[PDB]
Design a binder for these strands. Structure first.
Ligand code: MG
Length: 1356
RNA sequence: CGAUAAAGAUGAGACGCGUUUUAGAGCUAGAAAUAGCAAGUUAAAAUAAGGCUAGUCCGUUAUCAACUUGAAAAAGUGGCACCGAGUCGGUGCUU
DNA sequence: ACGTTTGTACTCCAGCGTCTCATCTTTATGCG
DNA sequence: TGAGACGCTGGAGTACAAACGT
């Protein structure tokens, strides 16, 4: 049989609702066979439900942890390189030194050598630690002591700098220098060179004006303000070049010959400074050197707080100053505390639990916490003025290793390491040869375009090797093919050609592509002759002629008439008849002109044999941005020219990639005539054929393109096609589950395709922005709006008084004040009525002290109220209070009333969705369903895929009182899918000619301007498609209210205009929808998933005696070293075995549920029996092991259901089917103050909800019965009942708003805490999965219709 | 209509902390329990256990009923109408 | 008739900041 | 430029009464 049905879907990020409806909007019921060893053999289920799953995670955290792993590996390798340099000479000094350093973590018992790592004896270690309290004392000593040192100490200093080498954000050289002296020298050079209008901001110390903690822009403003005459571009050119790595252009700020932006801290700075010095003429030379010296001084000013005149290690000397001043402040604070407050001494200096000094040093308190703790003590104390001054400066009792050390670059550490190497090079000859080698160890850094240095066993690697040997920092440039790796870095990410998915895409500035754009805009154009109106075709002679004369002489082409006139200087004139070509051609040769200008010879650019040289040049310029790669690549082309053109074109840069390959432009020869797409675009042969036209058939190019498209595509896979879509991974998971649900539903209904599939995807500072807009409008209008009332952000949510403020305290349609004392005076009126479109947003809403401005169904009346309000709306639109579209709608009556084009726009706004992801999933479903072809090879639409927006179904909820409360249960997903199906199939049945507007596929347009052409005297049963009013859903309502105070009735049974088929019966279909929404059984299924991710919590706990700790390495006992804790269970396994119980060695047979940690998953799957015997179970039944992932469903007595959260915790698995009357009452009561409707409807709802005050007790009884049946939380239920009895004498609105909160006790899933009325009910957790082991295990399919029930009591 | 900008996704290269164990001899009185006092800023190693494919790779993303074939990819497995509805039940035909 | 493991009830806790570079879609916005 | 910080839900420890073996 045909078995007509439809499928509705509600795709979400956490759920997928589905429903099957018949032609009468009924959900069919079916009985399904259940497998397993249970007695149950058939169960009846409705064909409606939802699938719940955890949200998909993006691959960001995994990428960050992978990068961290690579960084740790490379840091360890750096330390290993330094060790293997030092090893040979270290064996002659202390042979066990590196072994003692490696084993320093483990305890004294496990050490193979002495406990003291550095010297190996107690006396020398104590003497060393007394002489150098920190590593920075040793670093400064080794820089400045000019005496032979112990090689251990030299290694310790170099290893400290190599391990923590600082950042690489500043390129080029940097050295220690004051900032004020540098500014004085900059001003000196400025005055010396200019000798006219000298900027002399004397008395204004630039020190700490530029060095202020404010941003570079604010420091620049502070410096420029103190400058007497000089302001902005000019002096701030040099100032901003000092302050930042980017600076304004030297063409205006320094009179340079070209628009070259200045730079700093980059390799491009040297080349651009050379170019700017050449352009200016060396007049600005050394005036930029003074600025660069000031830049270095300003950059180092806040990291090296010590004078450089006494040492070459300012960093270490600054750290020693910090240590010394920490010691002085600590002893002063100790003396002051004991003398003033001896009772607080123990709390401050001994208690690690608080945020005192003991908690700051030995405890977990940070610097900010310590400052916050000790600040009120220092205020309450006297004689601590310098301590407070240091505290507000954040310079009190600081540590050397702090969070703020990230500003130290690598050049400072490199300078200290170089100083030490140069100081200790005489005594150790090996250090002299390895000096450059150790320096290269510190400064080496893998380029971002090279990536991981893999041999081939890596997903993420693209590096190519010039030689097959190990990569070290010293042979990196000799082994790694940097140019090929940099090319592959970009070419692995650029998208392939859509027509042929095998080869790459051509750069967007390529010559062969720009010529394609110009000639594809050429061949379609054909000037109209004067003799005959025939446009003919712009022939190839004029193809070359136009491009050579105009495009090849101007960047942007001339005007339409100007380009003609230019050609008419060589052709017939006074005949300007363009081929409807645009005013100015969109195409532009911009890269050929750049190449001709750089090469300084047009012959090179004109040369067609030299087109490949140009192509490779543009590809090199687009690919690389490091300029060393460009230099290396273009070095091969130096012969074709000279050095000047080489360095002029090396600085050129292009961005962007096209969408065609070279094959699709000049590769495919198009069979007959042997000419490529470009050649057809040159000479169409009096046919004037565009790219789109030519890429079709009749030239055999379409056959080869289709062959490549199908061959390379290979059908891919559904998972693959979903993978390379846009959007979040969570919505990709939702789409995949949706497709699998559709396949299962098709299988369920006798392998019969549905007639229709309805698609809907959930798309779920503006208050502060609205408050700012109200303030700006009040300031612009000069009105005392705040005097009436301030813009309260508490009231910024509510839309009632929005009009009392935005409309200038004046009625919108009436020329008087709005009377803000009475908000009930105003009545919200939609500008374009709801019979036209549901524009409930405030863009259309307006209020006029309830004045009947219009007696017409038009938006406003012609002139009249519109005219009077239009002037004030001109004022409000000037203030932007009235929106542009708002004013357009308000003026539309004086603009001719409501037009047919306007109504067409309203219904296309109500119907069409603009999201591309919805189009993608609709295309996927249509491709999967419609798979048959006709005899002429034409697709036949067995099913239709309808896409709907949320506004339609939401309005269907609000108008017809099918109210949704999310907190009650998960049935609302399935109900949304059912109403999705009902609305979609009613719309396609009642309006068939609008199927091009919301159904996927190539459909006849059926222009709505002819449909919406009905007048006030409605045609009815005609081609007008009942589209005068133009609300697409208005046909659902029995009586359509109008803004003119009239009610237009609509017949009880709706039918199609052309076909005589009943599409909506208002007397039976609403009852059917109500019955379906009141059905107690819908298939809610939680997707069982094996947990993946981290092994455990990342916190490394201190050592305990517990066995819950996890060893951090193989031979690190957690009892001695601490370790990780609280692992994550991948899945639980039900084992049946005999265990060693009792001191009498008894094999007590036991059935247990053991969880498999993610760490142990591979070991368990390699050999489950060996793993279980290792765990402690003897004689395991191998075939009785049941893998139970998370959310595994178990059924118990009285229908109680539990989901497996873990091996030792359960979740609630039941669903509360609250009756429709109670959820409707709860929605109406909770939304008392936010009814958002007509005043009569609001009064009726208030009367209905006041008449059913007893419904609260019934809802409480329902919750109590459901909790006593399946929840089994006695104490929480008693607290809930006591709280409800306590707050009985409360208004209905808050009572129902908190009864809504009460539903989380009975909600499906993990238990959660909730608050009813100032009382918090903590969650009751089922932390014992012992009753599960004798329950019924339910294996569910994706829809849950197919089941397999296993009685676990019978296993064992 | 170009064009910019934001958001999101993906990949690479790097810093600074944080945590853990050890090293930085605690002194005095008391037999000890305990007290009074002195100190404290730093370093080494690890930073998912680990894997082989031994790279200066890889290891937290995606995929996720049960059962029957297949190494895997994957394929295959479950009757329909009507009356009703507290998580689905009952009746009739054929299997 | 105690010890001994198990079942409620409650509390606490969970690695985090920054920078450079590149490639895509998809929306939007001011621009024409 | 502008901070807004938070939940979530499973593990672990602690205290104490009760089902439970000898
Ligand atoms: Mg939903």
């Amino acid at each position: 049989m045909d078995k007509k049905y439809s499928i509705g879907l509600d795709i979400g990020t956490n759920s997928v609702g589905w429903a099957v409806i018949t032609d009468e909007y009924k959900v069919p019921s079916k009985k399904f066979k259940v497998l397993g060893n249970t007695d149950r053999h058939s169960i009846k289920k409705n064909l409606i439900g939802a699938l719940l799953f955890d949200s998909g995670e993006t691959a960001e955290a995994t990428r960050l942890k992978r990068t961290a792993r690579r960084r740790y590996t490379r840091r360890k390798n750096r330390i290993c390189y330094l060790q293997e340099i030092f090893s040979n000479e270290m064996a002659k000094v202390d042979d066990s030194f590196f072994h003692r350093l490696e084993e320093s973590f483990l305890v004294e018992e496990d050490k193979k050598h002495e406990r003291h790592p550095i010297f190996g004896n107690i006396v020398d270690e104590v003497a060393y630690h007394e002489k150098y309290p920190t590593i920075y004392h040793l670093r400064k000593k080794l820089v400045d002591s000019t005496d032979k040192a112990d090689l251990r100490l030299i290694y310790l200093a170099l290893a400290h700098m190599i391990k923590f080498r600082g950042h690489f954000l500043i390129e080029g050289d940097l050295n220690p220098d004051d900032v004020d002296k540098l500014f004085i020298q900059l001003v000196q050079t400025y005055n010396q060179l200019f000798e006219e209008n000298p900027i002399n901001a004397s008395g204004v110390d630039a020190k700490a004006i530029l060095s202020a903690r404010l941003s570079k822009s604010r420091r620049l403003e502070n410096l420029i303000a103190q400058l007497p005459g000089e302001k902005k571009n000019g002096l701030f050119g040099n100032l901003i070049a000092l302050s930042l790595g980017l600076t304004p252009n030297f063409k205006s700020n320094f009179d340079l010959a070209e628009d070259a932006k200045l730079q700093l801290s980059k390799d491009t700075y040297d080349d651009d400074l050379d170019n700017l010095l050449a352009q200016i003429g060396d007049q600005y030379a050394d005036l930029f050197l003074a600025a660069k010296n000031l830049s270095d001084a300003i950059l180092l000013s806040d990291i090296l707080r010590v004078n450089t005149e006494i040492t070459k290690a300012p960093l270490s000397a600054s750290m020693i100053k910090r240590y010394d001043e920490h010691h002085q402040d600590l002893t002063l604070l100790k003396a002051l505390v004991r003398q003033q407050l001896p009772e607080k001494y123990k709390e401050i200096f001994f208690d690690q639990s608080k945020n005192g000094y003991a908690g700051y040093i030995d405890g977990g308190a940070s610097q900010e916490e310590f400052y916050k703790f000790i600040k009120p003590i220092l205020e309450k104390m006297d004689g601590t003025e310098e301590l407070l001054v240091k505290l507000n400066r954040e310079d009190l009792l600081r540590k050397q290793r702090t969070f703020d050390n990230g500003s130290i670059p690598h050049q400072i550490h490199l300078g200290e390491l170089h100083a030490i190497l140069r100081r200790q090079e005489d005594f150790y000859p090996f250090l002299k040869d390895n000096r450059e080698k150790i320096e290269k160890i510190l400064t080496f850094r893998i380029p971002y375009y090279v990536g991981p240095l893999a041999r081939g066993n890596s997903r993420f690697a693209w590096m190519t090797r010039k030689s097959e040997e190990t990569i070290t920092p010293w042979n990196f440039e000799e082994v790694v093919d940097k140019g090929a790796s940099a090319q592959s870095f970009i070419e692995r990410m650029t998208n392939f050609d859509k027509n042929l998915p095998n080869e790459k895409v051509l750069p967007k500035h390529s010559l062969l592509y720009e010529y394609f754009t110009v000639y594809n805009e050429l061949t379609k154009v054909k000037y109209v002759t004067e003799g005959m109106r025939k446009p003919a075709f712009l022939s190839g002679e004029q193809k070359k002629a136009i491009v050579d004369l105009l495009f090849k002489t101007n960047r942007k082409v001339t005007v339409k008439q100007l380009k003609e006139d230019y050609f008419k200087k060589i052709e017939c004139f006074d005949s300007v008849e363009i081929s409807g070509v645009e005013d100015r051609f969109n195409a532009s040769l911009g890269t050929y002109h750049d190449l001709l200008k750089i090469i300084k010879d047009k012959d090179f650019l004109d040369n067609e044999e030299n087109e490949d040289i140009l192509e490779d040049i543009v590809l090199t310029l687009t690919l690389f941005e490091d300029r060393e790669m460009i230099e290396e690549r273009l070095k091969t082309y130096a012969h074709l020219f000279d050095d000047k053109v080489m360095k002029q074109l090396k600085r050129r840069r292009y961005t962007g990639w096209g969408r065609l390959s070279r094959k699709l432009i000049n590769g495919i020869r198009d069979k007959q005539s042997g000419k490529t797409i470009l050649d057809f675009l040159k000479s169409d042969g009096f046919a004037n054929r565009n790219f789109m036209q030519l890429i079709h058939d009749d030239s055999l190019t379409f056959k080869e393109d289709i062959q490549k498209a199908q061959v390379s595509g290979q059908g891919d896979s559904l998972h693959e096609h979903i993978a390379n879509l846009a959007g979040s991974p969570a919505i990709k998971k939702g789409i995949l589950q949706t497709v699998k649900v559709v396949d299962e539903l098709v299988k369920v209904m006798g392998r019969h395709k549905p007639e229709n599939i309805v698609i809907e995807m959930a798309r779920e500072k503006n208050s502060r922005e609205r408050m700012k807009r109200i303030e700006e409008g009040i300031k612009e209008l000069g009105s005392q709006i705040l005097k009436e009332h301030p813009v309260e952000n508490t009231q910024l949510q509510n839309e009632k008084l929005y009009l009392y403020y935005l409309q200038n305290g004046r009625d919108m349609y009436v020329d008087q004040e709005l009377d803000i004392n009475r908000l009930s005076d105003y009545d919200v009126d939609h500008i374009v009525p709801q019979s036209f479109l549901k524009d409930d947003s405030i863009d259309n809403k307006v209020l006029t002290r309830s004045d009947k401005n219009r007696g017409k169904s038009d938006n406003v009346p012609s002139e009249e109220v519109v005219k009077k309000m239009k002037n004030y709306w001109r004022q409000l639109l000037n203030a932007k209070l009235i929106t542009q579209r708002k004013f357009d709608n308000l003026t539309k009556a004086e603009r001719g009333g409501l037009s047919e084009l306007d109504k067409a726009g309203f219904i296309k706004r109500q119907l069409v969705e603009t999201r591309q992801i919805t189009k993608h999933v609709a295309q996927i479903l249509d491709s999967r369903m419609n798979t048959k072809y006709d005899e002429n090879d034409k697709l036949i639409r067995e099913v239709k895929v309808i896409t709907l927006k949320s506004k339609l179904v939401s309005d269907f909820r609000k108008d017809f009182q099918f109210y949704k409360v999310r907190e009650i249960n998960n049935y609302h997903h399935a109900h949304d899918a059912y109403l999705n199906a009902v609305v979609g199939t009613a719309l396609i049945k009642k309006y068939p000619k609008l199927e091009s507007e919301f159904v996927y596929g190539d459909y006849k347009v059926y222009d709505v301007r002819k449909m919406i052409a009905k007048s006030e005297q409605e045609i009815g049963k005609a081609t007008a498609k009942y589209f005068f009013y133009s609300n697409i859903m208005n046909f659902f309502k029995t009586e359509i209210t109008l803004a003119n105070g009239e009610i237009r009735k609509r017949p009880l049974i709706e039918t199609n205009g052309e076909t005589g088929e009943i599409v909506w019966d208002k007397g039976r279909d609403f009852a059917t929808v109500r019955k379906v929404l009141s059905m107690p059984q819908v298939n809610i299924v939680k997707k069982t998933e094996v947990q993946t991710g981290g092994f455990s919590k990342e916190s490394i706990l201190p050592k305990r005696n517990s066995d819950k700790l996890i060893a951090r390495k193989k031979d690190w006992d957690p009892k001695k070293y601490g370790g990780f804790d609280s692992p994550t269970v991948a899945y639980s396994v039900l084992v049946v075995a005999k265990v060693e119980k009792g001191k009498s060695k008894k094999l007590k047979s036991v059935k247990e549920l053991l969880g498999i940690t993610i760490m142990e998953r591979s070991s368990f799957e390699k050999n489950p029996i060996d793993f279980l015997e290792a765990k402690g179970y003897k004689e395991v039944k191998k075939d009785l092991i049941i893998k139970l992932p998370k959310y595994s469903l178990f059924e118990l007595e009285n229908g109680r259901k539990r989901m497996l959260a873990s091996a030792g915790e359960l979740q609630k698995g039941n669903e509360l089917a609250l009756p429709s009357k109670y959820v409707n009452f709860l929605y109406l009561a909770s939304h008392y103050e936010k009814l958002k409707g007509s005043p009569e409807d609001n009064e009726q709802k208030q009367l209905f909800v006041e008449q059913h005050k007893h419904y609260l007790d019934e809802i409480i009884e329902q919750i109590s019965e459901f909790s006593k049946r399946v929840i089994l939380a006695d104490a929480n239920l008693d607290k809930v009942l006591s709280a409800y009895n306590k707050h009985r004498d409360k208004p209905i609105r808050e009572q129902a708003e908190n009864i809504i909160h009460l539903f989380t006790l009975t909600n499906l899933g993990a238990p959660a805490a909730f608050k009813y009325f100032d009382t918090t009910i903590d969650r009751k957790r089922y932390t014992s999965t012992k009753e599960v082991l004798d329950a019924t295990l339910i294996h569910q399919s994706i829809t849950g219709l197919y089941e397999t029930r296993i009685d676990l009591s019978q296993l064992g």
